Each structure stands twice: as C-alpha cells, then as structure tokens.
C-alpha cells in the first residue's frame with residue numbers, strides 16, 4: 013500500500029482545488045480520476061453550457077440588427093460548427109489541467125476508487141492499494157433519470173450529457189424540469205431554433221428562487237418562444253416512426269386531468285435532478301454514513317462520521333455549484349495541512365447566476381426566508397422594473413427587475429435578486445458587499461455609474 | 474421680485490436633483506432652464522453616446538457571427554436610422570423630465586439667468602427678478618475649442634455636440650484628444666465604419682488612468698482599426714474641395730519634427746476639453762470667486778465665497794460626471810432643507826466607466842497615487858490578464874486586464890482597475906465594497922460566480 017498525505021477521490025472542481033492547495037502547503041497528494049479531469053463543470057457543465065449560451069445570445073442580438081441600422085441576416089445556424097469548436101475548447105482545458113497537476117507534483121492515479129475492508133481507511137484502484145492519513149471523497153454527482161418502471165419509455169430521452177453530444181439541433185425539443193438546468197436548456201435550444209416545450213410540474217420555474225424571479229422567469233420564457241406546459245407530467249414515452257410520442261397529463265388544480273400527446277418530438281431531455289456518485293465507492297465497508305438518496309453526510313468542516321475521511325461538493329448534496337465545491341476544498345486543505353482548526357466554508361450569501369435570457373443573478377435570502385427569519389415587521393424590500401436602454405430602439409423587448417430584501421432597522425441588505433441584461437457580470441461585487449455586511453445606507457452612499465443597469469441597485473427607493 | 478426657498482440655475486444633472494430633493498423636503502423651488510431640460514447628459518452626453526455605443530457594439534459582434542455558426546452579414550450600416558431613433562429617445566426623455574418637475578411642484582423659469590447688482594443675491598430672467606435665501610448655480614460646462622489665433626482653421630471642425638447632429642457617417646474621421654470622450658468618439662466611428670485617426674499629444678491615451686489601463690487602451694484601439702497618431706499636433710486646418718486638409722506636426726522626442734498632411738478628412742472632431750459655463754452669469758456683480766479658467770470655487774459643502782450661493786457639477790471643474798453632480802445636489806438639499814450640517818459628497822472612490830471597446834471601469838486610486846500616499850513599501854498590487862471565454866471560438870480577439878491596488882498590511886483594497894467585456898456592468902458592486910472599506914481578505918472570502926469575467930476579481934493571487 014502506497015502512503016501519501018492526501019488521497020483525493022475525484023478530479024473535478026472540489027477534488028483538484030483541495031489537492032492543489034494541499035501540495036502547495038507541502039503535502040504529497042494524488043488525485044484519483046476515473047475519467048476526464050476537470051469533472052462535470054469542464055466536460056459537461058459550466059464550460060460547454062456557457063459556450064452554447066454565448067451562441068444563443070448571438071442569435072438573439074441578430075434580431076435587433078435591422079433595428080440598429082444594419083441589414084438583416086436570415087440566420088441558418090449551423091450546429092456542428094459551434095459543436096466542434098466547443099469540444100475543442102474542452103480538450104484544451106483538459107491538457108491545461110493535466111499539466112497544472114503534474115506541474116504541482118500531483119500524482120494522478122488513473123482509475124476507479126473503492127474503499128477496502130482494511131481497518132485503517134484504504135482504497136483499491138485497479139488491484140492496487142493506496143491510503144493516507146487524509147482521504148477526500150469528491151466524486152460529485154450525475155443525472156437523475158426515470159424508471160421504465162415509473163415512466164415507460166424513460167430511457168428513450170437524453171440528459172444534459174446527451175445534450176452535449178448532440179451533433180444536430182433537434183427540430184422539436186421537449187424539456188422536463190423547472191430548475192436552472194431545465195431553464196437554460198430550454199433557452200439555448202429555442203434561441204437556436206428548436207421548437208421547445210418546457211414541461212413543469214407547477215405554474216412556474218425556479219420556484220425556490222425569490223417569487224419575483226420565479227415569476228419573471230416563467231414570463232420571459234413564454235415571451236421568447238418557449239412553451240411552458242404547466243401542471244403537466246410525462247406519463248409514457250414511445251418511439252414512433254416520425255420521432256417520439258410523449259403522453260403527458262395536465263392536472264391544472266380546479267380542473268379535470270387531461271391526457272395529451274406531443275408527437276414528432278426529436279429530443280426529450282430529462283432535467284429533473286442530480287443523483288450522488290457514491291455506490292461504487294463501497295462506502296458500506298467503513299460505515300461512512302449517507303442519507304436516503306446516497307448523499308454523503310458531513311459536518312460544517314466536511315467531516316464524514318469516520319476519522320480521516322471528508323466529503324465536498326455535489327456528492328454531499330448541498331449547494332451544487334463549482335465555486336462552492338472549490339471553496340470547500342480550498343478551506344479544507346488549510347484546515348488539515350495549514351492547521352487552521354476553523355477554516356470551513358460559510359454556506360450563506362453564496363452567489364448564483366442562472367444563464368436564462370435575460371440572465372438571473374441572486375445572492376442571499378429570498379423575501380420569504382428573510383420574513384421567516386426576522387418576522388414580517390422587520391423586513392423591508394425595494395424593487396424596480398425597467399427597460400434596459402439597449403431596448404430603447406428595438407422592437408424586441410426584455411425587461412430588468414431588481415429586488416432588495418432588507419432586515420431590521422439598519423436595513424441590513426440580506427438578499428439581492430435580479431434578472432436582466434448584464435445581471436451575469438453584475439452580481440459578484442454586490443455579493444462581496446452583501447458578504448461584508450452592507451446595509452442599504454452603504455449602497456446609497458456609493459456614487460453611481462451612468463448609464464448602466466447596475467446603477468439601479470444603488471439608487472433604489 | 475418673487476421669492477422662493479430655492480432658486481436653482483440650470484436644469485441639468487445636478488440642478489434638477491437638488492431641486493427635486495428640496496421640493497420633497499417641503500421647500501419651494503424653481504429650476505431656471507435656458508434650453509432643454511436634462512442638461513448635457515440627456516441631450517448631448519450620457520444618453521446619445523450610449524445609444525451610439527450600443528450600436529458600435531453591434532457591428533463588432535456581427536464580425537463573430539460566422540465564428541458562432543451563422544452566415545455572415547455584409548453590413549451596410551445606415552446612420553440616419555439609428556440617428557433618428559436616438560433623437561426620438563431624447564425627446565421622450567425631455568417630456569418625462571418636464572412632467573416629473575411639474576409633478577413635484579417645481580416651477581420652471583424658462584430662460585437665461587444672470588445675477589443683478591442688488592445687494593442680497595438676486596437674478597434677472599428675461600427682465601424679471603427672482604431671489605431666494607438659497608441659489609444653486611449648476612450651469613455645467615461646454616466644449617473647449619481652439620482659436621483661429623492659435624490653430625488657423627480650428628472653427629472648421631466640430632465637437633461632441635456637432636457629432637450628435639451628424640446625419641451621415643463621415644468616411645474619414647480625425648479625432649484630437651486623449652480622454653474618455655476622444656477615446657469613445659474614436660471607438661464608435663471606427664466600429665461603425667469611418668477610417669478613424671486618434672491624434673494624441675503623447676504616446677498613450679487616458680494618461681491619468683492607471684498605467685495598465687492607459688497602456689491597454691492605447692493597444693486595443695490600434696488592434697481595432699483606430700490609427701493612433703502620437704506626439705502629433707494640429708498646426709492648421711484648411712477646407713479643400715475634397716474635404717479638409719489637416720497640417721499636423723509629429724515631434725516624437727529623440728527625433729526631428731515632421732510635418733504631415735491628412736487630406737480628404739470628412740470630420741475633424743475636437744475632443745480637447747470642457748470649459749465652464751460661467752461668464753454670462755455676471756458673477757462679478759457679487760464677487761463670487763472663480764479660478765483662472767472660470768470654474769466656480771466652492772468648499773467641501775459646495776459653498777461659494779458668498780452666503781446663500783453654492784455650486785455643483787461640471788461648473789466647478791471637479792469630477793465631471795452626472796452621478797457626481799447628482800450626488801452633490803442631493804446632499805446639498807439635505808444640508809440646507811433637512812438641516813443636516815454635514816451632508817457633503819465624498820470625492821474619493823468615485824466609480825467611472827469609459828465606454829471604449831472593451832469597456833474600462835475604474836474606482837479608487839491608481840498604483841502611483843497609492844504609492845505616493847502610502848509609500849512603495851506599503852502598496853501591493855495584484856493583476857491578471859485573460860481572454861474572456863466569449864473569444865474561445867472567435868478569430869477576433871480582445872482581452873481583459875484587471876489590477877487591484879492594496880494598501881498597508883491588511884491590504885485595504887484602495888483601487889480597482891480593469892478593462893474588458895462586461896466591465897461596464899461589473900464595476901458598481903465592487904465600488905460599493907471598495908467604498909465600505911473592503912480588504913483583499915473580504916474579496917477572497919466571497920464565493921465566485923463561474924463562469925464570468927467578474928469572478929477573476931475575487932480569485933486574484
């Protein structure tokens with residue numbers, strides 16, 4: 013058995029950062045990677061999505077061309093051109109990552125890890141055993157998919173991965189889900205041409221986002237060409253000769269259920285969830301506890317119930333984002349290897365941007381969460397709704413909405429929620445202020461930048 | 474003589490805000506406006522510029538169309554279409570402003586004010602006299618133009634105003650100046666098609682901006698098609714039959730001066746400066762002191778040397794921006810009418826964005842200013858330079874550069890300087906943090922938003 017100081021299972025966002033931080037502090041680590049380095053984000057997440065989103069934003073603006081004094085462009089978009097480019101970028105990123113690892117003296121055990129029966133924690137990668145006084149499970153998660161048992165014909169559809177493997181823009185797309193992935197897949201496909209349908213269980217999407225957002229977003233979708241199928245469910249999927257035939261059920265409360273066929277569907281995309289990547293780890297050999305869905309259970313310091321084993325990222329189920337994974341593995345290394353007894357990530361005021369059209373950005377508490385925490389009496393919220401001046405000359409229109417949630421008498425800014433043009437780059441700073449403890453006064457005592465959409469946040473009233 | 478509580482001379486950015494604030498606090502004010510309400514910003518500044526900039530950004534992205542899988546568009550841009558639209562927007566804004574005033578019970582004395590001989594401060598608007606225990610001069614400024622005396626043929630060229638009156642994109646443009654206006658006029662014209670030349674007195678532009686910016690910006694200009702004529706000066710301008718003929722002098726230090734003719738110039742734009750709008754006020758009747766250039770002299774509370782007279786905005790010469798004008802008139806009203814003895818605007822950490830391509834955004838001290846204030850020993854600066862992932866698939870390329878200036882041992886973030894895609898919407902938040910007193914630690918303890926250009930600011934190292 014080879015002994016290292018750190019043995020990180022999983023070369024994705026959290027895995028790598030924790031190993032990098034560790035090696036830079038003097039330790040000897042080894043990332044065990046079973047597939048391609050970079051994890052879900054580089055290979056089938058953040059990176060590919062953004063490229064496709066940038067592209068979607070491009071067809072959009074093409075529509076305001078004439079309005080800006082230029083001749084129109086018909087627009088026969090060629091899927092494969094941007095696909096092949098996107099995939100290249102991904103290769104370049106892989107190489108770059110491999111290099112950085114080796115550059116930092118990080119051994120890469122190339123294969124699939126699983127814990128052994130051995131008393132002291134140990135893992136076996138391809139018939140070989142490795143161990144270390146510190147092992148970090150950072151194996152992430154994967155797409156949740158329905159059962160033929162539950163939904164007959166479920167396996168006929170694809171997921172976000174399958175999406176990133178498509179070599180042709182499907183003519184008829186149907187997406188099932190109401191979260192950021194479902195919302196983004198719906199936006200890219202329909203902006204790029206596909207006749208998209210977003211099948212949601214309720215009346216709106218991003219339901220766990222501040223009411224205003226959940227509302228605005230369901231609307232901008234409709235306004236843009238996405239068909240939101242509310243209170244609908246996929247009963248069964250069938251492969252016809254002309255595509256797929258989806259049997260759906262619309263149970264609009266107050267009305268009688270109605271069965272519907274969506275025929276000639278080219279792409280059926282399941283965007284219902286991410287299940288943890290933990291069973292093939294043989295967690296049961298050590299008794300590393302998990303929840304009923306397989307998520308690995310950890311304390312505020314990412315400690316499993318076993319000594320010398322920790323967990324970070326998607327695998328734990330909390331705050332499924334690359335920066336949260338990174339930030340947790342970075343603080344862990346310091347904890348362990350720099351002896352900082354308290355470096356733990358703070359899970360409050362985490363910023364998130366959803367790349368829908370226009371983009372959403374949000375940090376902090378929703379109004380309801382503020383309310384349930386402070387009490388109606390101690391929660392003031394400021395809002396605004398305007399038309400970016402980009403649309404001052406376009407027939408096409410999107411709007412921008414911003415809401416500030418304030419707590420107590422000082423009006424501590426506990427939550428920022430907005431959707432609109434530029435909201436993607438706009439969030440990070442206010443997130444810093446929101447993280448430092450900013451109050452409304454501080455925001456109002458900042459000279460504005462005119463003309464910009466961001467200036468509307470420091471002049472609310 | 475009609476007496477009010479507040480008598481504001483000038484209905485622009487600072488004028489209006491101060492009057493609005495005052496009327497909302499119970500006072501009776503009257504904006505004296507000599508032309509169109511909204512001032513320079515609405516009529517010939519912020520508003521028209523941004524529309525033209527949005528347009529310029531549109532021809533730009535048209536170039537990356539094919540690279541994103543779409544067919545190309547030749548691009549015969551029609552100037553007048555966007556011109557007429559831009560002008561309409563401006564009318565709509567005027568109406569909206571007029572309304573707001575009257576809606577807030579603000580009397581609009583429509584004409585040209587000038588102080589009278591009268592002992593107590595008083596002004597005469599069209600043979601009629603008005604007075605008040607508080608008069609605010611907020612008459613702004615105007616384009617500086619060379620003398621036939623100095624530069625023979627100077628009056629042959631136009632300024633930023635003349636620019637906003639052009640009904641046709643000049644084929645050959647020559648811009649003279651090295652500041653944000655000169656830089657923007659150069660960027661809009663050349664992005665929109667005109668064969669532009671930027672005539673600067675030195676080797677770079679935005680010379681008073683952090684070295685990195687001054688440098689990067691001179692480069693992105695060249696890289697984009699703008700011909701930067703360094704160490705050059707306009708000797709004399711002459712009207713030929715084929716356009717204008719500019720006699721220039723290039724005195725590159727270390728070399729011998731060389732005379733040059735730029736012939737067939739369609740547009741000669743003077744972007745050398747803004748002179749104050751004060752002589753027709755008859756300031757001398759009261760002895761309201763000014764500087765040698767006519768700027769009105771005020772204390773930290775915008776107090777002139779006379780009691781009951783104040784000054785705000787461009788007229789004073791300090792921080793020539795709409796938000797600074799606004800912010801000063803807003804704090805003044807409170808001071809005066811809400812009896813807040815100390816509401817004064819803080820002139821440090823003022824944010825500014827220059828709409829060049831890519832956009833610049835900057836707040837706080839430059840490295841040199843940090844240095845001269847703290848000492849080389851106590852100033853650490855972090856930098857980064859990357860390619861936005863928008864260009865991961867485009868042949869065209871622009872880069873993004875960010876520099877953080879830190880002071881003392883805590884590394885108080887005293888200055889943020891960046892240029893790149895999205896830097897326009899990106900600044901406001903960090904400006905708030907920079908204004909609250911953020912240190913590098915605070916920035917590094919903020920979870921990032923991936924993927925974005927703004928995330929690079931909270932992960933510097």
Ligand SMILES: Cc1cc2nc3c(=O)[nH]c(=O)nc-3n(C[C@H](O)[C@H](O)[C@H](O)COP(=O)(O)OP(=O)(O)OC[C@H]3O[C@@H](n4cnc5c(N)ncnc54)[C@H](O)[C@@H]3O)c2cc1C
Nearest residue numbers: 022024025026046051052053057125152325326332333334
């Ligand atoms: C579509 C889509 C879009 C997304 N968009 C964004 C975005 O824009 N920004 C950011 O929000 N986040 C985004 N995410 C989320 C982000 O991708 C994840 O939250 C992040 O990737 C998780 O980090 P992690 O370290 O836990 O996991 P992961 O990066 O998923 O990595 C786990 C790695 O370990 C490997 N592995 C697994 N088991 C073993 C084993 N037993 N032995 C060896 N190796 C093993 C895996 O193969 C993989 O390479 C997106 C996800 C999807 C899916």
Ligand SMILES: Cc1cc2nc3c(=O)[nH]c(=O)nc-3n(C[C@H](O)[C@H](O)[C@H](O)COP(=O)(O)OP(=O)(O)OC[C@H]3O[C@@H](n4cnc5c(N)ncnc54)[C@H](O)[C@@H]3O)c2cc1C
Nearest residue numbers: 483485486487507512513514518586613786787793794795
């Ligand atoms: C091109 C160009 C681009 C700019 N871009 C930006 C930008 O993007 N953002 C922001 O940066 N700032 C911008 N500015 C600067 C901004 O326009 C000014 O700094 C702001 O307009 C100044 O406010 P102010 O109240 O002092 O003056 P002003 O708005 O200039 O207003 C003075 C008003 O008073 C009137 N007046 C003058 N004398 C009298 C009199 N005696 N009696 C009655 N009325 C009188 C004037 O006619 C005018 O209507 C720009 C300027 C130019 C020129």
Ligand SMILES: N[C@@H](CCC(=O)N[C@H]1CSSC[C@H](NC(=O)CC[C@H](N)C(=O)O)C(=O)NCC(=O)NCCCNCCCCNC(=O)CNC1=O)C(=O)O
Nearest residue numbers: 400401462463464465467468471486489490514515569795
């Ligand atoms: N900020 C976004 C949203 C659009 C926007 O900025 N609109 C401005 C552009 S006009 S360009 C003129 C410029 N406006 C600004 O700086 C706008 C920013 C902020 N809302 C404010 O309070 O000023 C100014 O000089 N203000 C001084 C003053 O007297 N201001 C008096 C108080 C504001 N008017 C009340 C708000 C609705 C009026 N909108 C309107 O009148 C219509 N539009 C506006 O006020 C963007 O840039 O796209």
Ligand SMILES: N[C@@H](CCC(=O)N[C@H]1CSSC[C@H](NC(=O)CC[C@H](N)C(=O)O)C(=O)NCC(=O)NCCCNCCCCNC(=O)CNC1=O)C(=O)O
Nearest residue numbers: 025028029053054108334861862923924925926928929932
């Ligand atoms: N942020 C800008 C700039 C471009 C960018 O974000 N590039 C990222 C996209 S790759 S998508 C993968 C994602 N990257 C990010 O989150 C990048 C953000 C920050 N620089 C960081 O420290 O991570 C991640 O999962 N990181 C975890 C980790 O192990 N990280 C180890 C430390 C970072 N690598 C060192 C910096 C150069 C490597 N660049 C590279 O490798 C090439 N590119 C990158 O790292 C944008 O979004 O356009």
